[PDB]
C-alpha cells in the first residue's frame, strides 16, 4: 500500500493530454496528499521521503504552470504597443476575454494553488483602457 | 472474541497507560514509542489518535484498544504454519524441490542425517510430496 505510490517530466506528458481541468489535476494531486496524510495517521522515514517527494512534485508542477504563466505575461507584453483597415481590425478584438483567460490562469494559481508582476497584471487590465485612449487620439 | 486475548490485551493496556490514568494520553504513548526508538512529530500522533479515538476523548481506552486489535488481527490457526513450512513456498503446486531440503540440512550443520524420510513419506510414490500427504508427514 506504500508501493501503490511509486513515482519528473511525465507531468508534462500529462499536460500534453490536454482550463479548470488543470485545477482538477492539482486537486487530484491534493487528494494524493490527503490520503498520504491519512496513512500518516495509519503509520515515517519511508513516509517522509515520499512526503518530500510530494513537496517536489506539486511545486515543480506549479512551476511548469508558472513558466507558461510567464510566457503568457511576456507574449501579452508584446502586443502592448490603408491604415484605417488596420485600425478597424484591431478594433474588432474578445481581447478582454483573452486577458481574462490569462488573469484567471494566473491568480487562481497564486491564491488557490498556494512575483512582483501582480501590479503588472493590474496594469495589464488597465492597459486596455490606456489603449482605448490612444485609439481615441488615433481617431484623427 | 477468545479468552486469553483478553489477558494479553489487559497486560498491554497496563503497559501503555503506565501512570494509571485509565485513559491513553499522548505522553505515555510517546513514551512507549520512544522506548521503541521512535520520536515522531506532534501532528501525526494527533491524526493517529484521532483515527483511533471514537468517543472524542483525545484519549483511547480498553474498548478502543481491543477494537483496533480485533480489526487488525481477525481481518488479516494451524493452516498457516504447517502450510508455509515448505509447501507454502510453492503455493498450491505439490512439488517440493529436494534441493531446498538439502539446503536446510546444509545450513543447520546437523551431525548425522539421512534423508530416507522423504524416501519413506513418498505417498504418490514418484519422488515428491503433495500437501495432504505433507500434513500426513507432519
From Swiss-Prot, chain A:
Top-rank taxon, per record: Eukaryota
Subcellular location: Cell projection, Cilium, Flagellum; Cytoplasm, Cytoskeleton, Flagellum axoneme
Coiled-coil portions: 85-105
Family: Belongs to the dynein heavy chain family.
Function as written in the Swiss-Prot or TrEMBL entry: Force generating protein of eukaryotic cilia and flagella. Produces force towards the minus ends of microtubules. Dynein has ATPase activity; the force-producing power stroke is thought to occur on release of ADP.
Domain notes: Dynein heavy chains probably consist of an N-terminal stem (which binds cargo and interacts with other dynein components), and the head or motor domain. The motor contains six tandemly-linked AAA domains in the head, which form a ring. A stalk-like structure (formed by two of the coiled coil domains) protrudes between AAA 4 and AAA 5 and terminates in a microtubule-binding site. A seventh domain may also contribute to this ring; it is not clear whether the N-terminus or the C-terminus forms this extra domain.
Subunit structure, as described in the record: Consists of at least 3 heavy chains (alpha, beta and gamma), 2 intermediate chains and 8 light chains.
Protein name, per record: Dynein gamma chain, flagellar outer arm
Protein species of origin: Chlamydomonas reinhardtii
Residue range from the parent sequence: 981 to 1161 of 4485
UniProtKB/Swiss-Prot annotation, chain B:
UniProt keyword annotations, A-Z: Calcium, Cell projection, Cilium, Dynein, Flagellum, Metal-binding, Microtubule, Motor protein, Repeat
Localization annotation: Cell projection, Cilium, Flagellum
Protein name: Dynein 18 kDa light chain, flagellar outer arm
Protein origin, superkingdom: Eukaryota
Positions contributing to Ca(2+) 1 binding: 17, 19, 21, 23, 28
SUPFAM superfamilies per UniProt: EF-hand (SSF47473)
GO CC annotations, alphabetized: dynein complex; microtubule; motile cilium
InterPro entries attached to this UniProt entry: CALM/Myosin/TropC-like, EF-hand-dom_pair, EF_Hand_1_Ca_BS, EF_hand_dom
Known role: May be involved in the calcium-mediated regulation of dynein motor function. Binds 1 mole of calcium.
Quaternary structure and partners: Consists of at least 3 heavy chains (alpha, beta and gamma), 2 intermediate chains and 8 light chains.
UniProt-annotated binding residues for Ca(2+) 2: 53, 55, 57, 59, 64
EF-hand domain residues: 4-39, 40-75, 109-138
A GO MF term: calcium ion binding
Protein's UniProt keywords contain Chaperone: no
Main location group: other
Amino acid at each position: 500500500t506504500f508501493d501503490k505510490y511509486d513515482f519528473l517530466q511525465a507531468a508534462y506528458d500529462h499536460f500534453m493530454r490536454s482550463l479548470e481541468a488543470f485545477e482538477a489535476e492539482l486537486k487530484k494531486y491534493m487528494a494524493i496528499e490527503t490520503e498520504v496524510t491519512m496513512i500518516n495517521g495509519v503509520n515515517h522515514p519511508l513516509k517522509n521521503s515520499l512526503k518530500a517527494e510530494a513537496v517536489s512534485w506539486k511545486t515543480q508542477f506549479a512551476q511548469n504552470l508558472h513558466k507558461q504563466c510567464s510566457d503568457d505575461l511576456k507574449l501579452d507584453n508584446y502586443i502592448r504597443d490603408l491604415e484605417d483597415v488596420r485600425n478597424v481590425m484591431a478594433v474588432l478584438k474578445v481581447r478582454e476575454k483573452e486577458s481574462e483567460i490569462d488573469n484567471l490562469i494566473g491568480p487562481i494559481e497564486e491564491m488557490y494553488g498556494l512575483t512582483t508582476m501582480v501590479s503588472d497584471l493590474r496594469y495589464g487590465w488597465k492597459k486596455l483602457k490606456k489603449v482605448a485612449t490612444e485609439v481615441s487620439d488615433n481617431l484623427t | 472474541l477468545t479468552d486469553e486475548e483478553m489477558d494479553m490485551c489487559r497486560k498491554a493496556f497496563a503497559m501503555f497507560d503506565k501512570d494509571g490514568s485509565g485513559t491513553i494520553d499522548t505522553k505515555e504513548l510517546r513514551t512507549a514509542l520512544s522506548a521503541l526508538g521512535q520520536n515522531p512529530t506532534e501532528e501525526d500522533m494527533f491524526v493517529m489518535i484521532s483515527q483511533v479515538d471514537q468517543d472524542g476523548s483525545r484519549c483511547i481506552e480498553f474498548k478502543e484498544f481491543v477494537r483496533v486489535i480485533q480489526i487488525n488481527k481477525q481481518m488479516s490457526a494451524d493452516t498457516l504454519d504447517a502450510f508455509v513450512a515448505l509447501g507454502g513456498n510453492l503455493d498450491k503446486t505439490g512439488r517440493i524441490l529436494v534441493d531446498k531440503l538439502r539446503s536446510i540440512c546444509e545450513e543447520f550443520e546437523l551431525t548425522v542425517n539421512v534423508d530416507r524420510l522423504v524416501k519413506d513419506a513418498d505417498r504418490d510414490l514418484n519422488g515428491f510430496l503433495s500437501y495432504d500427504e505433507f500434513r500426513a508427514l507432519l
